[PDB]
Structure 1
């Protein structure tokens, strides 16, 4: 149902706009963490983040997951499919799938893929 589809897309948009960037404790303090930003669970005995005190960054929780019906979909609402040639370009569903040309595809093959996608009426996320 497109109505529920749109409602859940808006719900996911709001939720992932409010979602924060989960980063390990003291990521800002040392360059070794700034150049390689990640999240690591705080395990220390006195870690304030582990103790989950107010005024400290938050930690990932299962509740933050987006609704099932629209999980992993493009913000436009389509479904991404990685494509490396025309053979697997042709195997998509234009009404429900979109093609993302792999970064390693040269321009010679990319122009062919783009013209074939135009012929088949399939949306392309990176048309160049």
Structure 2
């Protein structure tokens, strides 16, 4: 069903799974459109693995923003934080996975004094 928090409405949860991936190990759950001929899912038989459509698209006014109602931006050092100084209340910052504890403390403190929220603030400590 639809999920609605604040103004952000997510039109569908529980991401689509590939047909028959439940009962075949070689078939990964990642969605693939089934070509088939008599394919059930392709023909849209009721009660079987509905396919993604453009109609599920979230509205463009609130498309990419996180539950904190702002867009995420992934940074790798303190230098890539400069553009956030202007839109600190529209963007949250996430530190890249391959950033060391050297630099993570620096990015955390810089974002703190920049007044921009950090997503994975308590990582690697």
TM-score bucket of the superposed structures, by smaller chain? 0.7 to 0.9
Q: Give the C-alpha shift of residue 25 in structure 1.
A: 1.2
Confirm or deny that 1:62 pairs with 2:54.
yes
- Structure with higher helix content: 1
Residue 3 (structure 2) aligns with: none
Q: Alignment partner of 1:49: what SS?
A: coil
Q: C-alpha separation between the residues in 1 aligned to 2:94 and 2:77?
A: 11
Gaps of 5+ in 2: 1-5
| Distance in 1 of aligned mates of 2:40 and 2:29 | 20
RMSD (CA atoms): 1.3
Aligned to 2:34: 42
3-state SS of 1:116 partner: helix
Measured in 2, the distance between the counterparts of 1:116 and 1:25 equals: 47
Provide the TM-score with structure 1 as the length reference: 0.83
**Is 1:86 aligned to 2:117, yes or no?**
no
Deviant stretches of 4+, over 2 Å: none
Q: Secondary structure at the match of 1:118?
A: helix
Q: Give the superposition deviation at 1:21.
A: 2.3
Q: Tell me how far 1:43 sits from its aligned partner.
A: 1.1
Determine which structure has greater relative contact order: mean sequence separation of CA pairs < 8 Å that are 6+ residues apart, divided by chain length: 1
Q: Gaps (5+ residues) in structure 1?
A: 1-5
Specify the SS of the correspondent of 1:108: helix
Answer whether contact 2:16 2:52 (CA < 8 A) is retained. Answer: yes
Q: TM-score, normalised by structure 2?
A: 0.85
